[PDB]
């Protein structure tokens, strides 16, 4: 709220040098991925000319700490926080003026590392940086830079999925979701390993075999690379992306087939351990798609995705809450109320973006309060007219809520219990309890 | 085989002292490490490799400061989180920095955990309190100390004071972290004496007696009296190297004539004297004639204070301290630098004792006054007074078990850090152990209710 | 599109202390952390062959306290520059030790023709002694200081290696 409107606006290259440097320093958040050699691998804001000396400084500081056998995990400078992650040859540093915790910035840097490792498998990365530490990774990362930039933009905008390390799901009936999963099973192929149906970035259905299990890290990686980044639209149509899925197998290449269900943007993802399966997976999709319109489930999916997150009044009749964010510790999945209630009905992109950023920053402050290291906090209430907020971290779930300041803890606890009760009532209709057969 | 958390190293440096090469070692006006600190710890040789490590650490801190000058728009690096240590960089004043890396607990390869280590806010508060005490015992400000006494004398004084302080410093959580993080003046449980007529139970006549002592006694500028411990029962109460209790604290502050910052410094020195009697800085050895007087007016030991502008007496004073000690009470009396002669000290001491001994019983009666289980902590930012009820951490019968004490105090420090309340909105945070912390900002008091199950 | 070279320029204890690098780099993109961190940080682009190349200059401090962390700054250095002063006698005499320190500390893959362009910043060290060290190992392109003209040769030697 201190210049966030132009924070996502990139630094123009036509400006002279010192104005560009001042603009770069004025950015609220910076993501800097580099090698152990200090070479600029990727920067969210500004080209490598702008960030080159700064990245060298960061690398030599971390290398100072590595030489002292005491790895550096980050440091604070007033309101600014620098978080440093060392994933082998790769050094990730996040500079935040938005007051996030070390854990949240570390999770965001871990997500960036996850995307990079998905681009090229871990043994290949380690070998290319070991047998040649003087390696510029920007070569193989030619197509990955746009995805990383968009993912970092989503992080700055406020990513609840990354904050909670979970995923969102369509509010589908349990019978309807079971029918969709059974339709998914009725068209299955031996080469198919991980089936996935998503609608508007929200999980719809998951298909996994008995032996191999779909780790939540893999799902987070897929959603970050496709829906959080929004790069799935790029090269629209059939999309045969080689993949890594390091949680499943980081030493090998899977292959994910992405298709648009336009026959809001419903997507079908099919991950197979063989490169030649694509055509067969194509025959899979036409088999699945034809089943969906015939049974009408595709139209239902599109209609459910078209309506966004349910409004706070509809979820809780006559509630003082403006928004909430409920995460279930099992099933690793979350849900939230519509963001349209925060902003006035007639608003521009900048106003809605500012409202989302404010609410998300409140949520990350609450999340940091709950998950402070060596602090067994269970409930946290704050008053940032004002704006009251509560966060509850029962070992079975995790709920954050925001209301106008004229509510108080007494009523806010009642509202939090109410929304938790609603989520428990609709647990089967909100979360993927189990995968496919 | 668990290695406890200890101060990995500490250093005080002025970057403006070392400009060119072969003057970088002049930057480190003080340096200490655990191996160096061992001798001082027992009481209270450097080589090229160690000097290289010291210069590397100081240059690394300066490099972080300069690198973050651009991003933070003037704010320097204050906290550094590393795998094996927690580093605190505090700018004590303009151009003077103290960098302290505290080694985390090693658990048998090693696993490095900071479960019991003080948070960065509390470590910075302790370092600032030590720096304020050093200023209290030496000059007005470190820059003035240097420009007056030369870098060699500054190095000697810093070495002595900081070796003594770091010998007894506990990087782990201990005592009352909630009171320690705020700094300020820790008032006793009774608070202050009665201001005017009608509060004689709290010590209104007692406060009048103290004020008349200030005015009547020649050369007396200020008086602060604090209660530490209990009434007389071989006691050896003034030592024990223990911790200041929750009830212990300043009872009657100055009559004015002292800035609240320097008044806080004097009160902290009183606490240090109570904890480290005969071992505190200045060596407050009890008088041979009578044990009531220690650090008499008769080595002209004088502490340096800044007087309040609303006083006749540009504001530095260099007053002379005299500590009159009773079993429960400690009176620190700040006399003028020259007006009371040391020659008349034997005569002045008898009058002082005759004017404070009859005060002992009424003072004991008045300080005994007190204003599910609820603990609060009111810290008035304007007047720096701190009145708290949160119990201190028991040493390894209080109403607390030690584990609960550490958990509660670490939690409280977490709310203070999150609430941006430490000097250097309502935050209501609960837990699964039945503790309900409620931090409120009174409009400038900062209350911290600590409701228990 | 974009090619990157992390230049490591080895000042022989203050010889290369921004005496000549000041007017080379755009001073806007700088970080004078050589006194504390142990390396001045610079960045400059050159026109090598019909396409630009960025070099991140690391003007190493060379102090003994930073030597133990030598592999820290020397990681992945595609370029090295042995810089001395023509007037100073010990400037040229320390080149062999500096080169051995680089060769052992970072261990370049093929140091036989590793980029080792020498900048003779402007005498005890004559031109004969100036290229004697060059012809000793590989005839490295020494240039007496127009400084940019001694760095596109660095790119021509480095891109062909990549």
Author numbering:
A (entry chain A): 195 to 457, 486 to 606, 612 to 664
B (entry chain B): 11 to 54, 92 to 155, 182 to 306, 312 to 376, 389 to 403, 426 to 483, 500 to 524, 544 to 571, ...
C (entry chain C): 5 to 126, 134 to 156, 163 to 178, 182
Give sentences copied directly from the paper behind this entry.
In each complex, two subunits that contain three longin domains (LD1 to LD3) each form a heterodimer, which is required for catalytic activity toward the cognate Rab GTPases. We here report the cryo-EM structures of the Mon1-Ccz1 and Inturned-Fuzzy core complexes bound to their cognate GTPases Ypt7 and Rab23 in the nucleotide exchange transition states, revealing a conserved catalytic mechanism with distinct modes of substrate recognition. Thus, TLD RabGEFs rely on both conservation and variability in the switch 1 regions of their substrates to realize catalytic efficiency and specificity.
To provide the molecular basis of these observations, we determined the cryo-EM structures of fungal Mon1-Ccz1 from Chaetomium thermophilum (Ct) bound to nucleotide-free Ypt7 and of human Fuzzy-Inturned in complex with nucleotide-free Rab23. To support the formation of a stable transition state of the complex, the nucleotide-free variant CtYpt7N125I was coexpressed with CtMon1 and CtCcz1ΔL in Escherichia coli. Analysis of purified complexes by cryo-EM revealed a mixture of dimeric CtMon1-Ccz1 and trimeric CtMon1-Ccz1-Ypt7 particles. In the trimeric complex, the structures of Mon1 and Ccz1 remain virtually unchanged (RMSD, 0.67 Å), and we assigned the additional density to the G domain of Ypt7. The experimental map does not reveal unmodeled density that could be interpreted as the Mon1NTD or Ypt7HVD. Consequently, our structures do not provide support for models that suggest an autoinhibitory interaction of the NTD of Mon1 with the longin domains or recognition of the Ypt7HVD by Mon1-Ccz1 at the chosen conditions. Remodeling of the Ypt7 switch 1 region by Mon1-Ccz1 causes an opening of the nucleotide binding pocket, removal of a guanine base interacting phenylalanine (F33), and the insertion of a catalytic lysine residue (K38) in the binding site that expels the magnesium cofactor. Collectively, this structural arrangement was shown to lower the nucleotide affinity of Ypt7 and thus promote nucleotide exchange.
